[PDB]
């Protein structure tokens, strides 16, 4: 919690890489959660103007 | 007695000061500025009305994000927090989610516990079993 | 929301209805003397 | 016993602890939190309070702006009676829906009694020659939350 | 491609917009409230 | 001092050295640096979480854009925890004695 | 219907109004019964006395309490 | 218009009210006229209740200047060096008193759009959210498709 | 033992109700990452530009790395490296450059 300003900022707004196996999965149900992760709607620090968005890798 | 307007400079400037940051000829020409300034003011009032709705939607989105991060859905979290007589609004809930992660996890655990007690009561249909967190406290 | 639950439990459908959250005064002097009553 | 897809509900089965053991564990947890409060091992406290129709999450040395004028002079201390939530790094106390006055005490000093910037309110109707312009200057107050105290009177 | 002749909601041929379960539930709730009202208005 | 940190006004040069000296004074052998969490390492903007373990017990953890920066931040966090300048510390007492 | 609502004192929505249970007003309530919710007024503690006028309240469930937040 | 004007965050001068409260009004200069009809309210204010205000607020230096001026003015100078000039032209004694009390109560900061109704330093007690604050750790810190 | 949420991610929630029943308390001590759930820090140290004949020239070779590209390929490389689009890196005109606030407000 007692981080400096710049490392705290980096930790809070860091990008995350998620994996998603698409074997025998509906493309729509894959795409809904992939889009949620892409927008960043799973972050409490989310905002439309902020660039909070994580990478999604679908295999 | 001929009367003419002598403060027209200030009359024009009172309108032109609100359009200095515009684009095109609307920041210079008075005819094109009066229409643009009026639209700016109308949009200002409408967006003042809509700012509360936009911020409430943002807070709700952040609460959904945090709750789903804790493995819980937003409607369930809200209704169980209400059933626990915890009257924290969406702004405070989003503030806690962003800045008080342990407190938000505790609130999510309490909401999930209340949901489990409600489900157990509904399944049992028994009056004598009462949940520990399902008790209602009246005004004192 | 939970207006139906509050109605069933007997409270107001709105948390701002005759509840202790609004009926009670929300501030007082640090000396302990009571604050002037609220207009609402 | 057959095991089909719809023969069992699609959620984990939940089992709840027995009420007497739950009450004993609750007593133990309350005692531990109370002993932490008595020892004063909490570092900093934040509190969610209800004031002037809004809920504020404030800590010590905090600043808040209230959109209405109060019946106090500048520099006066005020006890915020409605405290819904208190929290520290280790424990957290919730009200149902409010906490106790003897349990929590929050003090705020009045700093500035001012007025807001001129807000524009204009109504306009198309091709009806209806324009109405108004200026709003809402009085405002500034409060500095100084200290948040908690007492060991926690049963 | 699927044009609606005339206006959407006034002409002889209108838009075939259906009735939803939410609308049915709202009407049922209103009917229950009115039944309670007409019971209380009896004696 | 309200809203200010310790190292913002101290401006030390070797946080890890200062931490190891303080631990030697406090009878601790040495902190071991371990990469706790990370997100992306081949990208241009990585993030690394580096923790310091004393006798396999976590004492501090710090984020950074690189491993060295994360380790330095973890050392600074450990120093702040040791010296009592935590962000959640007791606020200064402003009262009449 | 608008005039009946106006004369019943129900101009403002979601504000309860107390009325008699006589047929004279029951006729108007029947006329506008589709715009109103009607409940019976319950008095667990009796009618409010002259010393309890200023400490009463009307709950959402319909009982008019005589002593509301004493002390 | 917020986009057309300036803005600032909620703040206090020199952490006012933290250790002690210091009144931000430093000096108050009234410029009025002894015979102009527009200065009648200012004259009555000076006759009646400028002394009471001075006694109530000993931390502000009050100057009064009767000079041949057409519009009466009040100049409030604050500890920041901020100067607020108001016109008391053709106002009642009660209006003058209300304006003077408002000037005394104000902090002297610019009256512009305030971005937030609140301001605190270090609001991240017990931590601040980062994407790793609520994710479980795996044995050995292995990646999802990494084989040890 | 019982817990509505798993105690594996950063705090251990223990809920309780006061004897009066009007207060819900909860003890949530933080959780440290165990030593067995971490990996050693990787060290990258390689000086392949060193020369046994002239160390000054060896240092110069490793320090004089330079490269230049056109705007098109440079913006393409930047977009590929930061996972953005090419449109972000193009400049803006005077009308947009001069309307930026010289002294934006700062919080904290
Ligand atoms: Mg409104
Ligand atoms: Mg009102
Ligand atoms: Mg058509
Ligand atoms: Mg038609």
Coordinates of C-alpha atoms in Angstrom, one line a residue, chain G residues 5-63:
Chain G
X5 CA -58.6 13.6 -8.4
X6 CA -58.3 17.3 -7.9
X7 CA -61.3 17.4 -5.4
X8 CA -60.0 14.4 -3.5
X9 CA -56.8 16.2 -2.6
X10 CA -54.7 13.8 -4.6
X11 CA -53.0 16.3 -6.9
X12 CA -49.5 15.3 -5.8
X13 CA -48.5 11.7 -6.4
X14 CA -47.1 9.3 -3.7
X15 CA -48.5 11.4 -0.9
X16 CA -51.1 9.6 1.2
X17 CA -54.3 11.3 2.2
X18 CA -56.8 10.2 4.9
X19 CA -60.4 10.1 4.0
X20 CA -63.7 8.8 5.5
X21 CA -65.1 5.4 4.6
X22 CA -68.6 6.8 3.8
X23 CA -70.4 6.0 0.5
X24 CA -70.3 9.7 -0.5
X25 CA -66.6 9.6 -0.9
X26 CA -66.6 5.9 -1.9
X27 CA -68.4 7.0 -5.1
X28 CA -65.6 9.2 -6.2
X29 CA -63.0 6.6 -5.1
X30 CA -64.9 4.1 -7.3
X31 CA -64.8 6.6 -10.2
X32 CA -61.0 7.0 -10.0
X33 CA -60.2 3.6 -8.4
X34 CA -57.7 2.8 -11.3
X35 CA -55.4 5.7 -10.4
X36 CA -55.2 5.2 -6.6
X37 CA -54.1 2.8 -4.0
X38 CA -56.5 2.4 -1.0
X39 CA -55.5 1.0 2.3
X40 CA -57.3 0.9 5.7
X41 CA -55.9 3.3 8.4
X42 CA -54.9 1.2 11.4
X43 CA -54.4 2.6 14.9
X44 CA -52.6 0.2 17.2
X45 CA -52.2 2.8 19.9
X46 CA -55.5 4.6 19.4
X47 CA -56.2 8.1 18.1
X48 CA -53.4 10.7 18.7
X49 CA -54.1 12.7 21.8
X50 CA -53.5 16.5 22.1
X51 CA -50.2 15.8 23.9
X52 CA -49.1 13.4 21.1
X53 CA -49.9 15.4 18.0
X54 CA -46.3 16.4 17.3
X55 CA -44.7 13.0 17.8
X56 CA -46.8 10.9 15.4
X57 CA -45.9 9.3 12.0
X58 CA -47.6 7.2 9.3
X59 CA -45.8 4.0 8.4
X60 CA -45.7 2.7 4.9
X61 CA -47.6 -0.4 6.1
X62 CA -50.5 1.7 7.3
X63 CA -50.4 2.0 11.1

